[PDB]
Structure 1
């Protein structure tokens, strides 16, 4: 176990010090991305995932993504962005 057993672990009152506010890229950063993607285009690996999203399918797309990106959480999100381009292309 990693917490003592106290029936009433609340002699003091917490200060609710925390912030839901999460780092947001903002339209300032988003505008840069739109202008940069406009000219530079997608990456060769990312382009391949877009084809798989319309062909071999999502398990295959995630497998290709995970190998390249290296994190399941990152891979799923990259897949989600590439999916919005590919599916709505």
Structure 2
């Protein structure tokens, strides 16, 4: 156990306030990425995830991204970003 057992925990009023909205991506940054996306296209691995996504092979895509990036959160989120391109097509 990592917490002391006090049933009446709460002797002082607590001002827990992160007072923070989730960090906004920011409109200007999205615009700069759009200009770069036109100039640079997409990385070879991203195109291969898109081809696996165009065919219905989503587990293959997640496994290929998890090998490419090395973290499930960023593998899933890359699969869901690149899927918009294939879904738009």
1:20-65: per-residue Cα shift (whole Å, max 9, x none)? 4122221110010000001110000000000000125110000001
5+ long unaligned stretches in structure 1: none
Two-structure CA RMSD over aligned residues (Å) = 1.1
Distance 1:75 1:19 in 2: 30
Answering whether residue 32 of structure 2 is matched by residue 29 of structure 1, we say: no
5+ long unaligned stretches in structure 2: none
Q: Which structure 1 residue ranges, 4+ long, deviate > 6 Å from structure 2? A: none
Distance 1:38 1:67 in 2: 26
